[PDB]
Protein backbone atom coordinates (compact mmCIF):
# COMPACT_ATOMS: atom_id res chain seq x y z
CA UNK A 1 0.00 0.00 0.00
CA UNK A 2 1.34 3.33 -1.25
CA UNK A 3 0.04 6.22 0.83
CA UNK A 4 0.80 9.69 -0.53
CA UNK A 5 1.34 12.67 1.75
CA UNK A 6 0.27 16.26 1.15
CA UNK A 7 2.69 18.62 2.93
CA UNK A 8 5.72 16.59 1.82
CA UNK A 9 4.23 14.63 -1.15
CA UNK A 10 6.18 11.53 -0.07
CA UNK A 11 4.84 7.98 -0.16
CA UNK A 12 4.70 5.48 2.68
CA UNK A 13 4.47 1.75 2.09
CA UNK A 14 2.36 -0.33 4.47
CA UNK A 15 1.02 -3.78 3.67
CA UNK A 16 -2.51 -4.45 2.49
CA UNK A 17 -3.19 -6.80 5.42
CA UNK A 18 -3.00 -3.62 7.52
CA UNK A 19 -4.20 -0.83 5.23
CA UNK A 20 -5.91 -2.50 2.28
CA UNK A 21 -8.38 -5.11 3.49
CA UNK A 22 -12.18 -5.04 3.22
CA UNK A 23 -14.67 -3.26 5.47
CA UNK A 24 -16.24 -5.72 7.93
CA UNK A 25 -19.45 -4.03 9.08
CA UNK A 26 -20.50 -6.62 11.66
CA UNK A 27 -17.09 -6.80 13.32
CA UNK A 28 -16.62 -3.05 13.55
CA UNK A 29 -20.17 -2.72 14.85
CA UNK A 30 -19.55 -5.27 17.58
CA UNK A 31 -16.36 -3.58 18.72
CA UNK A 32 -18.04 -0.14 18.70
CA UNK A 33 -20.93 -1.54 20.76
CA UNK A 34 -18.52 -3.17 23.21
CA UNK A 35 -16.51 0.04 23.47
CA UNK A 36 -19.60 2.02 24.43
CA UNK A 37 -20.71 -0.74 26.80
CA UNK A 38 -17.32 -0.69 28.49
CA UNK A 39 -17.58 3.08 28.65
CA UNK A 40 -20.82 2.70 30.59
CA UNK A 41 -20.08 3.40 34.25
CA UNK A 42 -23.23 1.75 35.59
CA UNK A 43 -23.90 2.79 39.19
CA UNK A 44 -27.60 2.74 39.92
CA UNK A 45 -29.47 1.05 42.72
CA UNK A 46 -33.07 0.88 43.77
CA UNK A 47 -34.60 -0.22 47.03
CA UNK A 48 -35.58 -3.86 47.23
CA UNK A 49 -38.53 -4.92 49.33
CA UNK A 50 -35.80 -6.41 51.52
CA UNK A 51 -34.31 -2.93 51.85
CA UNK A 52 -37.23 -0.50 52.22
CA UNK A 53 -37.13 0.85 55.76
CA UNK A 54 -40.37 -0.33 57.29
CA UNK A 55 -42.07 -2.60 59.79
CA UNK A 56 -42.62 -6.32 59.49
CA UNK A 57 -46.12 -6.76 60.83
CA UNK A 58 -49.14 -7.54 58.76
CA UNK A 59 -50.96 -4.19 58.50
CA UNK A 60 -54.22 -5.97 59.29
CA UNK A 61 -55.22 -9.52 59.95
CA UNK A 62 -55.70 -11.98 57.13
CA UNK A 63 -59.36 -13.01 57.39
CA UNK A 64 -62.27 -10.99 58.71
CA UNK A 65 -61.70 -7.54 57.22
CA UNK A 66 -63.34 -6.24 54.08
CA UNK A 67 -59.95 -5.12 52.75
CA UNK A 68 -57.58 -7.09 50.54
CA UNK A 69 -55.09 -9.72 51.58
CA UNK A 70 -51.86 -8.02 52.59
CA UNK A 71 -49.02 -9.06 54.80
CA UNK A 72 -46.28 -6.52 54.39
CA UNK A 73 -46.53 -2.76 53.99
CA UNK A 74 -43.24 -2.94 52.04
CA UNK A 75 -44.84 -4.91 49.16
CA UNK A 76 -43.99 -3.97 45.57
CA UNK A 77 -47.65 -3.41 44.69
CA UNK A 78 -48.20 -0.84 47.44
CA UNK A 79 -47.39 2.85 47.59
CA UNK A 80 -43.80 3.54 48.70
CA UNK A 81 -43.08 -0.15 48.48
CA UNK A 82 -40.03 -1.71 46.98
CA UNK A 83 -39.07 -1.93 43.37
CA UNK A 84 -40.14 -5.44 42.39
CA UNK A 85 -36.91 -6.32 40.55
CA UNK A 86 -34.45 -3.91 42.12
CA UNK A 87 -31.14 -3.26 40.37
CA UNK A 88 -27.57 -3.37 41.60
CA UNK A 89 -24.11 -1.97 40.97
CA UNK A 90 -23.06 -4.15 38.07
CA UNK A 91 -20.33 -4.69 35.49
CA UNK A 92 -21.34 -4.71 31.81
CA UNK A 93 -17.89 -5.12 30.24
CA UNK A 94 -18.32 -6.98 26.98
CA UNK A 95 -15.19 -8.90 26.03
CA UNK A 96 -14.02 -8.50 22.47
CA UNK A 97 -11.19 -10.84 21.55
CA UNK A 98 -7.71 -9.57 20.74
CA UNK A 99 -7.86 -10.62 17.10
CA UNK A 100 -11.41 -9.25 16.83
CA UNK A 101 -10.33 -5.83 18.10
CA UNK A 102 -7.34 -5.77 15.78
CA UNK A 103 -9.52 -6.87 12.87
CA UNK A 104 -11.88 -4.00 13.62
CA UNK A 105 -9.01 -1.51 13.67
CA UNK A 106 -7.63 -2.93 10.41
CA UNK A 107 -11.12 -2.66 8.93
CA UNK A 108 -11.64 0.99 9.78
CA UNK A 109 -8.13 1.96 8.73
CA UNK A 110 -8.76 0.34 5.35
CA UNK A 111 -12.13 2.09 5.25
CA UNK A 112 -10.55 5.45 6.06
CA UNK A 113 -8.03 5.11 3.23
CA UNK A 114 -10.75 3.93 0.80
CA UNK A 115 -13.15 6.74 1.80
CA UNK A 116 -10.17 9.18 1.57
CA UNK A 117 -10.20 10.71 5.05
CA UNK A 118 -6.76 9.93 6.56
CA UNK A 119 -4.50 12.84 5.68
CA UNK A 120 -0.92 11.70 6.27
CA UNK A 121 1.85 14.17 7.12
CA UNK A 122 5.53 13.85 7.97
CA UNK A 123 5.15 15.52 11.40
CA UNK A 124 3.00 17.98 13.29
CA UNK A 125 4.69 20.79 15.15
CA UNK A 126 3.84 24.09 16.81
CA UNK A 127 6.43 26.30 18.47
CA UNK A 128 4.69 27.58 21.58
CA UNK A 129 1.46 26.10 22.99
CA UNK A 130 -0.91 28.68 21.51
CA UNK A 131 -4.31 27.30 20.55
CA UNK A 132 -4.72 30.42 18.42
CA UNK A 133 -1.75 29.17 16.41
CA UNK A 134 -3.15 25.64 16.34
CA UNK A 135 -6.51 26.78 14.97
CA UNK A 136 -4.57 29.04 12.58
CA UNK A 137 -2.55 26.05 11.35
CA UNK A 138 -5.65 23.89 11.05
CA UNK A 139 -7.51 26.52 9.05
CA UNK A 140 -4.41 26.70 6.84
CA UNK A 141 -4.62 22.94 6.38
CA UNK A 142 -8.41 23.40 5.73
CA UNK A 143 -10.01 21.12 8.30
CA UNK A 144 -12.83 21.59 10.81
CA UNK A 145 -13.34 18.23 12.54
CA UNK A 146 -9.92 16.66 12.92
CA UNK A 147 -8.20 13.83 14.77
CA UNK A 148 -4.43 14.23 14.91
CA UNK A 149 -2.96 10.96 16.17
CA UNK A 150 0.66 11.56 16.96
CA UNK A 151 3.80 9.78 15.91
CA UNK A 152 5.76 10.69 19.02
CA UNK A 153 4.79 12.52 22.18
CA UNK A 154 4.11 16.26 21.79
CA UNK A 155 3.09 17.82 25.10
CA UNK A 156 3.02 21.20 23.37
CA UNK A 157 0.29 19.79 21.13
CA UNK A 158 -1.47 18.40 24.23
CA UNK A 159 -1.53 21.93 25.64
CA UNK A 160 -2.52 23.46 22.32
CA UNK A 161 -5.41 21.04 21.73
CA UNK A 162 -6.80 20.79 25.27
CA UNK A 163 -9.19 23.69 24.67
CA UNK A 164 -10.30 23.24 21.08
CA UNK A 165 -13.75 21.69 21.09
CA UNK A 166 -13.46 19.78 17.83
CA UNK A 167 -9.81 18.68 17.67
CA UNK A 168 -8.47 15.51 19.26
CA UNK A 169 -4.81 14.65 19.89
CA UNK A 170 -3.84 11.08 20.75
CA UNK A 171 -1.11 8.47 20.61
CA UNK A 172 -0.91 5.89 17.86
CA UNK A 173 -1.01 3.27 20.62
CA UNK A 174 -4.00 4.66 22.50
CA UNK A 175 -6.38 4.77 19.54
CA UNK A 176 -9.95 3.57 19.68
CA UNK A 177 -12.62 2.85 17.06
CA UNK A 178 -15.21 5.26 18.48
CA UNK A 179 -12.78 8.14 17.93
CA UNK A 180 -11.40 6.83 14.63
CA UNK A 181 -14.95 6.50 13.27
CA UNK A 182 -16.59 9.61 14.67
CA UNK A 183 -13.92 12.16 13.77
CA UNK A 184 -14.32 13.28 10.20
CA UNK A 185 -10.74 13.89 9.02
CA UNK A 186 -8.04 11.80 10.69
CA UNK A 187 -4.56 13.31 10.39
CA UNK A 188 -1.78 10.78 10.91
CA UNK A 189 1.93 11.35 11.40
CA UNK A 190 4.15 9.09 9.27
CA UNK A 191 5.79 7.96 12.50
CA UNK A 192 2.32 6.98 13.72
CA UNK A 193 1.86 5.04 10.46
CA UNK A 194 5.08 3.16 11.29
CA UNK A 195 3.91 2.54 14.86
CA UNK A 196 0.52 1.22 13.77
CA UNK A 197 2.01 -1.02 11.08
CA UNK A 198 4.03 -2.40 13.98
CA UNK A 199 0.89 -2.49 16.12
CA UNK A 200 -1.18 -4.58 13.72
CA UNK A 201 1.58 -6.40 11.73
CA UNK B 1 -22.01 -20.13 40.23
CA UNK B 2 -20.65 -23.42 38.91
CA UNK B 3 -23.31 -26.08 38.50
CA UNK B 4 -23.11 -28.80 41.12
CA UNK B 5 -22.68 -32.30 39.75
CA UNK B 6 -25.02 -34.89 41.22
CA UNK B 7 -22.42 -37.18 42.71
CA UNK B 8 -24.68 -40.21 42.55
CA UNK B 9 -24.87 -39.83 38.80
CA UNK B 10 -21.14 -39.22 38.60
CA UNK B 11 -20.51 -42.43 40.53
CA UNK B 12 -22.99 -44.42 38.45
CA UNK B 13 -22.38 -43.29 34.87
CA UNK B 14 -19.54 -42.70 32.45
CA UNK B 15 -19.61 -40.53 29.34
CA UNK B 16 -18.35 -42.50 26.35
CA UNK B 17 -16.70 -41.28 23.16
CA UNK B 18 -19.45 -40.23 20.76
CA UNK B 19 -21.63 -38.83 23.55
CA UNK B 20 -23.76 -41.59 25.03
CA UNK B 21 -23.72 -42.77 28.62
CA UNK B 22 -22.92 -46.26 29.92
CA UNK B 23 -23.90 -47.88 33.20
CA UNK B 24 -23.92 -51.14 35.10
CA UNK B 25 -26.98 -53.34 35.00
CA UNK B 26 -29.55 -53.84 37.72
CA UNK B 27 -30.49 -56.96 39.75
CA UNK B 28 -26.95 -58.17 40.34
CA UNK B 29 -26.27 -57.46 44.00
CA UNK B 30 -28.08 -60.08 46.07
CA UNK B 31 -30.33 -62.95 45.94
CA UNK B 32 -28.80 -64.83 43.06
CA UNK B 33 -29.37 -68.55 43.31
CA UNK B 34 -32.99 -68.30 42.16
CA UNK B 35 -31.94 -66.18 39.21
CA UNK B 36 -30.66 -68.31 36.36
CA UNK B 37 -27.17 -68.30 34.93
CA UNK B 38 -27.82 -66.67 31.57
CA UNK B 39 -29.59 -63.84 33.37
CA UNK B 40 -26.43 -63.08 35.33
CA UNK B 41 -24.29 -63.72 32.27
CA UNK B 42 -26.20 -60.99 30.47
CA UNK B 43 -26.41 -58.63 33.42
CA UNK B 44 -22.61 -58.73 33.70
CA UNK B 45 -21.43 -56.36 30.92
CA UNK B 46 -21.96 -52.62 31.12
CA UNK B 47 -24.33 -51.10 28.60
CA UNK B 48 -25.77 -47.84 27.36
CA UNK B 49 -28.71 -45.75 28.49
CA UNK B 50 -31.76 -45.47 26.26
CA UNK B 51 -33.20 -42.53 24.31
CA UNK B 52 -35.41 -40.87 26.88
CA UNK B 53 -33.42 -41.00 30.10
CA UNK B 54 -30.29 -39.55 28.52
CA UNK B 55 -31.69 -36.05 28.98
CA UNK B 56 -32.25 -36.70 32.68
CA UNK B 57 -28.71 -37.89 33.24
CA UNK B 58 -27.35 -35.01 31.18
CA UNK B 59 -29.22 -32.76 33.60
CA UNK B 60 -27.58 -34.59 36.52
CA UNK B 61 -24.05 -34.60 34.99
CA UNK B 62 -23.64 -31.20 33.33
CA UNK B 63 -19.83 -31.31 33.41
CA UNK B 64 -19.57 -34.15 30.87
Amino acid sequence: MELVLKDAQSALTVSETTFGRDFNEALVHQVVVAYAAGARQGTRAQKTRAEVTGSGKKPWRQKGTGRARSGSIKSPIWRSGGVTFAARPQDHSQKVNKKMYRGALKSILSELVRQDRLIVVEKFSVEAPKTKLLAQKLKDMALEDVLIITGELDENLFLAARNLHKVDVRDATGIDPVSLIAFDKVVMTADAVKQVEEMLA
Amino acid sequence: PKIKTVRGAAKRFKKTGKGGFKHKHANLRHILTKKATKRKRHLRPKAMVSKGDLGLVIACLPYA
Binding site: - | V6, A9, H23, C60
Partner: protein, 143 residues
Amino acid sequence: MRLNTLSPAEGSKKAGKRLGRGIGSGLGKTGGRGHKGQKSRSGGGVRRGFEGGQMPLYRRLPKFGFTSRKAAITAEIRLSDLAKVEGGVVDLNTLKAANIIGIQIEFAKVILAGEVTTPVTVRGLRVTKGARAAIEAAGGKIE
Protein backbone atom coordinates in the same frame (compact mmCIF):
# COMPACT_ATOMS: atom_id res chain seq x y z
CA MET C 1 -18.74 5.68 7.13
CA ARG C 2 -20.19 7.53 10.09
CA LEU C 3 -20.96 6.29 13.59
CA ASN C 4 -24.69 5.85 13.10
CA THR C 5 -24.61 3.69 9.95
CA LEU C 6 -22.93 0.64 11.51
CA SER C 7 -25.86 -1.71 11.13
CA PRO C 8 -25.25 -5.33 12.26
CA ALA C 9 -25.40 -8.54 10.28
CA GLU C 10 -28.98 -9.60 9.58
CA GLY C 11 -29.31 -12.48 12.00
CA SER C 12 -27.14 -11.37 14.88
CA LYS C 13 -29.41 -9.64 17.35
CA LYS C 14 -32.35 -11.75 18.41
CA ALA C 15 -35.56 -10.24 19.74
CA GLY C 16 -35.92 -11.89 23.13
CA LYS C 17 -39.26 -12.95 24.57
CA ARG C 18 -41.06 -10.54 26.87
CA LEU C 19 -43.40 -12.87 28.71
CA GLY C 20 -46.89 -11.74 29.60
CA ARG C 21 -47.41 -8.44 27.77
CA GLY C 22 -50.66 -8.78 25.90
CA ILE C 23 -52.55 -10.82 23.34
CA GLY C 24 -50.56 -9.90 20.27
CA SER C 25 -47.36 -10.59 22.18
CA GLY C 26 -48.00 -14.30 21.65
CA LEU C 27 -46.63 -15.02 25.12
CA GLY C 28 -49.98 -14.02 26.53
CA LYS C 29 -51.38 -13.74 30.01
CA THR C 30 -49.80 -17.00 31.18
CA GLY C 31 -46.30 -16.58 29.82
CA GLY C 32 -45.48 -19.98 28.41
CA ARG C 33 -46.31 -21.81 31.63
CA GLY C 34 -49.80 -23.19 31.15
CA HIS C 35 -52.43 -23.20 33.88
CA LYS C 36 -52.28 -23.81 37.61
CA GLY C 37 -49.50 -26.40 37.74
CA GLN C 38 -46.47 -26.60 39.93
CA LYS C 39 -44.35 -25.58 36.98
CA SER C 40 -46.52 -22.48 36.63
CA ARG C 41 -46.17 -21.29 40.22
CA SER C 42 -43.60 -18.61 40.94
CA GLY C 43 -40.39 -20.33 41.89
CA GLY C 44 -41.85 -23.64 40.84
CA GLY C 45 -40.14 -26.59 39.31
CA VAL C 46 -38.52 -29.84 40.40
CA ARG C 47 -34.94 -30.72 41.19
CA ARG C 48 -32.65 -32.76 38.96
CA GLY C 49 -33.21 -36.49 38.86
CA PHE C 50 -36.83 -36.31 39.92
CA GLU C 51 -39.35 -38.66 38.36
CA GLY C 52 -42.18 -38.19 40.78
CA GLY C 53 -41.82 -40.02 44.00
CA GLN C 54 -40.26 -43.13 42.50
CA MET C 55 -36.57 -43.96 42.34
CA PRO C 56 -34.63 -41.82 39.85
CA LEU C 57 -32.37 -43.54 37.35
CA TYR C 58 -29.22 -42.68 39.28
CA ARG C 59 -30.63 -44.49 42.29
CA ARG C 60 -32.01 -47.50 40.47
CA LEU C 61 -28.68 -48.28 38.85
CA PRO C 62 -25.75 -49.53 40.96
CA LYS C 63 -22.31 -48.02 41.33
CA PHE C 64 -19.18 -49.32 39.72
CA GLY C 65 -15.52 -48.86 40.23
CA PHE C 66 -13.10 -46.48 41.89
CA THR C 67 -10.90 -43.77 40.44
CA SER C 68 -7.15 -44.21 40.39
CA ARG C 69 -4.66 -41.55 41.42
CA LYS C 70 -2.36 -42.62 38.58
CA ALA C 71 -4.89 -41.79 35.87
CA ALA C 72 -5.01 -38.00 35.84
CA ILE C 73 -1.22 -37.63 36.09
CA THR C 74 -0.52 -39.57 32.88
CA ALA C 75 -1.16 -37.74 29.61
CA GLU C 76 -1.08 -38.73 25.95
CA ILE C 77 1.05 -36.95 23.36
CA ARG C 78 0.17 -36.96 19.68
CA LEU C 79 2.90 -37.23 17.07
CA SER C 80 2.07 -33.73 15.86
CA ASP C 81 2.99 -32.38 19.31
CA LEU C 82 6.59 -33.50 18.88
CA ALA C 83 7.17 -30.84 16.21
CA LYS C 84 6.08 -28.19 18.71
CA VAL C 85 8.93 -28.82 21.15
CA GLU C 86 12.05 -26.84 20.25
CA GLY C 87 15.24 -28.85 20.28
CA GLY C 88 14.61 -32.17 18.58
CA VAL C 89 14.72 -34.12 21.84
CA VAL C 90 11.59 -35.17 23.73
CA ASP C 91 11.62 -35.81 27.46
CA LEU C 92 9.17 -34.95 30.21
CA ASN C 93 10.93 -31.82 31.45
CA THR C 94 11.36 -30.53 27.88
CA LEU C 95 7.68 -31.19 27.14
CA LYS C 96 6.46 -29.65 30.41
CA ALA C 97 8.51 -26.60 29.47
CA ALA C 98 7.07 -26.70 25.95
CA ASN C 99 3.47 -26.67 27.30
CA ILE C 100 2.33 -30.08 26.06
CA ILE C 101 1.35 -32.15 29.10
CA GLY C 102 1.35 -29.89 32.14
CA ILE C 103 3.20 -29.70 35.43
CA GLN C 104 1.13 -32.48 37.05
CA ILE C 105 2.08 -35.23 34.56
CA GLU C 106 4.62 -37.86 35.55
CA PHE C 107 4.27 -40.72 33.07
CA ALA C 108 3.37 -40.21 29.43
CA LYS C 109 2.59 -41.95 26.16
CA VAL C 110 3.08 -41.25 22.46
CA ILE C 111 0.23 -42.03 20.07
CA LEU C 112 0.09 -42.65 16.34
CA ALA C 113 -1.97 -39.57 15.51
CA GLY C 114 -0.83 -36.98 13.01
CA GLU C 115 2.37 -36.89 10.99
CA VAL C 116 5.95 -36.16 12.01
CA THR C 117 8.74 -35.34 9.56
CA THR C 118 11.91 -34.14 11.31
CA PRO C 119 14.14 -36.53 13.30
CA VAL C 120 13.06 -36.68 16.94
CA THR C 121 14.85 -38.60 19.70
CA VAL C 122 12.29 -39.76 22.26
CA ARG C 123 13.78 -40.49 25.68
CA GLY C 124 12.12 -41.96 28.76
CA LEU C 125 8.59 -42.07 27.31
CA ARG C 126 6.56 -45.19 26.73
CA VAL C 127 5.65 -45.29 23.03
CA THR C 128 3.06 -47.53 21.35
CA LYS C 129 3.77 -49.89 18.45
CA GLY C 130 2.31 -47.71 15.70
CA ALA C 131 3.84 -44.49 16.98
CA ARG C 132 7.19 -46.19 17.60
CA ALA C 133 7.18 -47.60 14.05
CA ALA C 134 6.25 -44.15 12.71
CA ILE C 135 9.10 -42.52 14.64
CA GLU C 136 11.73 -45.04 13.53
CA ALA C 137 10.45 -44.57 9.98
CA ALA C 138 10.93 -40.82 10.47
CA GLY C 139 14.50 -41.30 11.73
CA GLY C 140 14.20 -41.37 15.52
CA LYS C 141 15.99 -43.21 18.32
CA ILE C 142 13.43 -44.52 20.78
CA GLU C 143 14.68 -45.71 24.16
